[PDB]
Amino acid sequence: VDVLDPALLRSGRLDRKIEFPLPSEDSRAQILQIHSRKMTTDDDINWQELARSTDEFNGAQLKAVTVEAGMIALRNGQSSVKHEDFVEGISEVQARKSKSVSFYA
Amino acid sequence: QFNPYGDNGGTILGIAGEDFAVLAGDTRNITDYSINSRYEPKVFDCGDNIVMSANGFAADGDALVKRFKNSVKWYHFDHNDKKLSINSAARNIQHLLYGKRFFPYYVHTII
Amino acid sequence: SEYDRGVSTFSPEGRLFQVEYSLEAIKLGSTAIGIATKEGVVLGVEKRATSPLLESDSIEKIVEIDRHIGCAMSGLTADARSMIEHARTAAVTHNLYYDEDINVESLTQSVCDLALRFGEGASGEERLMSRPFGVALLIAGHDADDGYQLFHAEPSGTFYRYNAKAIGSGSEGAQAELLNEWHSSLTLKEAELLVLKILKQVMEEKLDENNAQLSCITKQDGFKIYDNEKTAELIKELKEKEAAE
Amino acid sequence: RYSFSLTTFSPSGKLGQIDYALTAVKQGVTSLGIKATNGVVIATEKKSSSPLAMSETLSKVSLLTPDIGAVYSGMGPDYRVLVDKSRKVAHTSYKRIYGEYPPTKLLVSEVAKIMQEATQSGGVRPFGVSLLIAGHDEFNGFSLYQVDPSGSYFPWKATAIGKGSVAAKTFLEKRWNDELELEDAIHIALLTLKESVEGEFNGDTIELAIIGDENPDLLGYTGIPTDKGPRFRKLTSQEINDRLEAL
Amino acid sequence: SAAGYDRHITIFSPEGRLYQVEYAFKATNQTNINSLAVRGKDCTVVISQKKVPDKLLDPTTVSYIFCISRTIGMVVNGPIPDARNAALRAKAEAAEFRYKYGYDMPCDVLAKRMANLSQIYTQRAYMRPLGVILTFVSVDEELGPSIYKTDPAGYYVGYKATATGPKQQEITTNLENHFKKSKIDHINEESWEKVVEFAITHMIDALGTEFSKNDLEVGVATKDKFFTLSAENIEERLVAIAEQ
Amino acid sequence: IGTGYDLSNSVFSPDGRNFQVEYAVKAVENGTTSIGIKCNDGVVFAVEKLITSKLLVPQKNVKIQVVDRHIGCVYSGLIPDGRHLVNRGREEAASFKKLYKTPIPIPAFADRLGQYVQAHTLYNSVRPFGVSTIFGGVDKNGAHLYMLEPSGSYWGYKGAATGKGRQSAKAELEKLVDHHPEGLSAREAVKQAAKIIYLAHEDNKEKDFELEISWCSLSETNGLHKFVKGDLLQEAIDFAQKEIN
Amino acid sequence: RNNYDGDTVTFSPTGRLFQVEYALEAIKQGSVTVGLRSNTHAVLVALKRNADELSSYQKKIIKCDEHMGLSLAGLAPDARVLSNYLRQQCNYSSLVFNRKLAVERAGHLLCDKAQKNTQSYGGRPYGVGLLIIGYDKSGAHLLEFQPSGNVTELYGTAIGARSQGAKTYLERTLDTFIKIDGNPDELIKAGVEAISQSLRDESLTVDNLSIAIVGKDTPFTIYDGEAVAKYI
Amino acid sequence: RYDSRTTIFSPEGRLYQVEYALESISHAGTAIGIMASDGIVLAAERKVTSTLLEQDTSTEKLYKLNDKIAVAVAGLTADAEILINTARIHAQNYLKTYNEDIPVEILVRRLSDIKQGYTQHGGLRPFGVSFIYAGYDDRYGYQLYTSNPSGNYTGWKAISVGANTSAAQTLLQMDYKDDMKVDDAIELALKTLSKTTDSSALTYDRLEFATIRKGANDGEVYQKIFKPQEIKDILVKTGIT
User: Fold this and answer.
1) How far apart are CA G171 and CA G163, in angstroms?
2) What is its main location (chain G)?
3) Residue C36 region, left (φ>0) first, then alpha (ψ -120 to 50), else beta?
């Protein structure tokens, strides 16, 4: 909206400006579930656990996590998704590597 | 003034056998012309098959026993559960006794 | 990236970057191999001669810590000077306090406690080292109630017991061979020649006694640093072994 | 980039914190000093930006010791501490070593020395002010000195500092003589200062004091003729009025 | 502008004045209250407004006027945190002066040691300046009624009357016109009570708003003593105004 | 608002605020609802403790603590930040018992606490506290209840609230004050304390809660602090359930 | 945002600290351990890692005292420090008060330690979660330590990498194992069942198990090898 | 860059801070020591002037540290003040301890060490002062050194530090001789100063002077800061006035 033209907002030429924030914790829990429905769905998945972990994530970013969870699961050949797969789907959509052993791992 | 020590009598005795070894002592504790107590263990097991008796002046002796007791636990924690030898113990106690030297313990110890 | 300059100080993964970077100092260094056997632990090292004016056997990469605890080293010898001194003191005070030969496991922990000081101030042990150390050790010895052990001290303050462990540049390659070459039934002459077989492959120059320096922990001999005459004899026997094959 | 430590020098040399401190000084009030051969007159003007505020409450002319007074130009808060620290060092270093107040030359060095420390540390800022210190001692005569937030001191016959400095300075250059009375020096002083402001110039708001010859009046004790009264004397408004009327 | 050094009170501007020290003079309008103090002819009165926006607060703990020591008041404008710390320091200083030097600490000596303390907070970088204007009131052992306003820079200057707050300028002009027309520097009323009444009259005029006995807190210095008045003693004064 | 001024907790903004100190208040918002109800003969504290995983042991984790033995404290915000603040409150109270040989006045307590928050907003290597602490009790001058904000600001209260459900919590709290001019009797202010937190738990509907109520009463605890337990707590639960439907 | 993550003494707008959240992430990145307990016994069961198969493992169970002991998950450096300090507290209790230090008090001192470095400049949130067990007068307790310093009493919890499968399992049997009492063996059994589901692409070995038990009439003991091969 | 601390180094192994601190000394007035084998003369130029500046009753860049060694000052005066006081204490401390006055070589070494320390250690400025040392001690006779702000020293038979360093040094070595004379040395400082300075008057009010001689009396050593009216008198003789 910084790029947006100032004279369009100026005065009561256009009224009511509505800002959509980042999803809340509440909103994140709902967004993963709905997408999951389309693939295989298991109730060992605790969706609250996932919503806490993600920080600064959009709904776009979460659709990719749902799809990714499906990519890792197919790769292994497990025809039924786990919660484990899902947790490994946060760190391959993000550019980080959590797959690298350390000095305590 | 103050007297930082006094005395508390008693007799302790160590006899070393050749596969059993005995550390004995009286349970009478006295001060001056009172018998304070009939019964009172002064020979204390410390674990790892080590008995310790520290007899003289009660203040000095009970405190030293207690301080050694703490060490045996510290030894298992930092040395991953290594038993203490009697001779190794004998050396630990030298460093406990000399560790105050300008207000020293004033009990004759036998382990 | 942008989370790495400090030592306090994280890190979206959760790791201390400064600590992980010191791992990479160890690969800069010259290859050192150790192999525990049930007859003793052999600590061989590589030395590298920048000029054939650097006097090989006046550079020390194996050092004596006590009469029963030894170390080999790799990485910065600036950091190894403080690192080693600490441990030499640990063994000498342990003999003073308890008369008993320091246990290898506890001797490692003393090194690694000192490794832990990173910060410039903490609760508990009061931090007074301004950075992690830049040196690993292989720690070898023999205690009486657990026999021969070979440990690797890390500059990150963690200790892994090993049957065999390599550090230095040639760490990856040695480690690959030793996966195919350790046994329960190996012997100390066998160990000695095992270290050299692995060593020639991971040295950039060639195998000479000038550029090698093996040593043993045997209960009988105690800690014995060898000579080059000794080391040369072993080299000549490696070459014989590989000839037949 | 060389501006904002005290630790960073420019490529051309010098430190910025000292340079920026000098800027600060020049924003402060117009104060001036003229050395005479039988005195020193030190003078400043005052304000409060509200008439409700009383003008004796402020003191911009303060005796540092009984024989040595001082003024400033620059930030108000910084003066008040630095004068406390100066009186306190005056006793430590010299009123226990002579058992009385130090000579003028000495004490210039000691105050200049607190400045030097407020530059030396980093994360401690210089002081915001430049002092004139004038005093009298028994071996170098009457004297005048400038003590800069730099931690450098400069001896002066006449100088001015503060907002009206550049104009006051050229008026002083012309009008000064090598031999003046205490009385004539006061008249050159009130007049110089009247360059800086007109129509709000009165003796009430102008603080003007001297280090002249001993006064037995402010000695406070009598019968001991082997010690001298305060060389410093603060003049009142009504007395400044006699001199301003007489112009 | 900006760059360094609105981040530091130990690093000067090219202006020569510290920008963060100036922000403490913009942090003094934070609680939106105004103070008035005037001098009588053996008393000092100081009155600052009370805001109790919700019935949850108890108007007896909502105050800005403090008892600093037996003879010394203070009213604070600006935030509660720096108000407590300043008040504490002052309480400690007042108390200390006595064992060292004997008698009750004059308004002037307290104000000056707190001003010098504010200047030190700006000297060092490891301490920030305070965020309050302190207006101290006492009747002095030998100088009688005295008001000294000490600002959070470390500047201190006395007064015949002073006002502080965001609506200050209006009270200040109100006072200029008053003290100028009388041709004196004091209020010539000879009891503490008719000086409290006059002060009430003048704050009502300047701001332009009727206030209540739950919106005033009034502290009164007489010689040798200081007290803060409760709401029901404050009403007596109000009903005196409301029909003369 | 703008860039900078946040970062460091002693930098003053061009707005006359200190942003870092505000940002703390925002952290306290996220915490679990707490209220204090002052009385004419007691104080009541009640708190909303969420149970977020059902493997938790019931009635065993609390954000209620006692201080000395006469003053109740309960905090919102970040839990372990809140434990440290009550902890320094115990040292101060305890110091007070040796020097002056009397229980702390509740206003005396408030002064000491208010200074500690002010000091951790006063440097550049300390951290501003991210907690409110409702606390008080009953002492020599009758009942007093105070609330300390993470800005280092405090006041007395006839009703205090902090937490998530704090807007709902203030609406009911005001009502209490108007229907009850005496300020509500302490016994019935326990039953009332339960109901107000039940209404606040509808802004947090997703998670279960456990109701812990404690008090301090001149009349019904002999001026001592103690928790509300057994049948008494049961009544408070039953009353609250009733009036919400 | 993500720029306030530079240090621990600085807050974010919504109010967090990114460093504490990061220390938290680290627990997951390390080791896995699953804790559970009963009215009569407390048991920790944990997976030990090794760098490679010439490595012979690194123990995760630290005997604190003969009535207290802990497991670790995350940074091994961090852990060595907190355990040493805790051991100091038990000996202190013994020395001066003659008392087996209560599990409830103990976690709170641990919490106090944690917060020192969170406030201060220098230091760092401790990079490890710990599950502390003990059996005192008030029976078994099991505590969950966090990098924030919050200490949480549970019947059963699990932390570390992919530990949620143990938590789903424990949840299912919760009340089942609470009833199990006077039988140490069966609590070891349940515990092996919980950490199995968590694992995936690895299964148990003799040297991966370290089972740590304290109960009613037994001290703290760390079992290894041929004392965990009845529950392999 | 690698300005930002003083405890850093640069990709070339320079340190910008040591260079910058060095250039500070060419901002402040000329200072000249010329050693001759019949005395050392110290001469210095002022860097401040005006008809109401007092400079006709005072020295401020000739300090006797002790009673046989003195320095000329070039660089910042604030920086200069502290190190002059430290230097005088250590020179004189030796006096107390050993009951004979400090040798020239040791005192310059000491003060250079203090200089160096501000670069080596802490988060402090280096000290931007170049002191020309002129002493006598009976081990090497007459000794001329100057110390760099880097904090090292080298002996000299003539040196010039302070403003216009390069120009002055060229001027001095054209007309200098090894045999020399103390009286020819005074005339040489006055010769060099006319050219180097940007003031064409070059009168007494701008000039400081001290000559240190052992030819002054016999068996005895005399440090004489000249007074302002002698400085005038010698300007006629060299003909500049």
Assistant:
1) 13
2) cytoplasm
3) beta
Local structure of F35: helix, strand or coil: strand
**For residue H130, what are the CA distances in angstroms to C32, G125, H74, H149?**
53, 50, 5, 6
Using alpha carbons only, give the angle C155, C161, C166 rounded to the nearest 5 degrees: 65
**Closest-CA distance of chain B to residue G54, Å:** 22
Q: Which helix (H) or strand (E) holds C167?
A: strand C164-167
Do H74 and H130 form a contact (C-beta atoms < 8 A)? yes
Distance from CA of B7 to the nearest CA of C (A): 30
Resolution for this PDB entry, in angstroms = 4.5
Q: Distance between alpha carbon D79 and the CA centroid of its chain, in Å?
A: 11
- Residues 6 or more apart in contact with residue H46 via CB below 8 angstroms: H29, H55, H61, H205, H206, H207, H208
Nearest-5° Cα angle at H185, H181 to H191: 140
Task: List Cβ neighbours of H157 (8 Å cut-off, separation of 6 or more).
Answer: H35, H144, H176, H178
Q: Is F130 on the interface with G (CB under 8 A)?
A: yes
> CA of A84, closest CA in chain G: separation in Å?
6
Torsion of CA B43, B47, B50, B55, to 10 degrees: -30
F32 is catalytic: yes
Contact E61 F155 (CB under 8 A): yes
Residue with tokens 């002081």: D127
Asked if F127 and G119 come within 8 Å (Cβ–Cβ), the reply is yes
Beta carbons of G8 and C8 less than 8 Å apart? yes
Written as six digits, the tokens of H71 are 């320095």
Which of the other chains make 3 or more beta carbon contacts under 8 angstroms with chain E? D, F
Residue C184 tokens read as 């329960």
CB C66 within 8 A of CB C102: yes
CB contact under 8 A, G168 and A46: yes
Distance CA H60, CA E145 (A): 51
Q: CA torsion A44→A48→A52→A53, rounded to 10°?
A: 20
Tell me the two tokens of residue G18. 């990114």
CA distances from E220 to A1, D240, E60, E143, E231 (A): 57, 38, 17, 17, 14
Return the residue of G nearest to F7 by Cα. G10
Active-site pick, F3, F32, F102, F133: F32
As a whole number of angstroms, the distance between CA C205 and CA C195 comes to 16
C35 DSSP β-pair partners: C42, C164
Burial status of residue E185 (CB atoms within 10 A of its CB: 0-12, 13-18, 19 or more): exposed
In single-letter form, the type of residue at position A44 comes to D
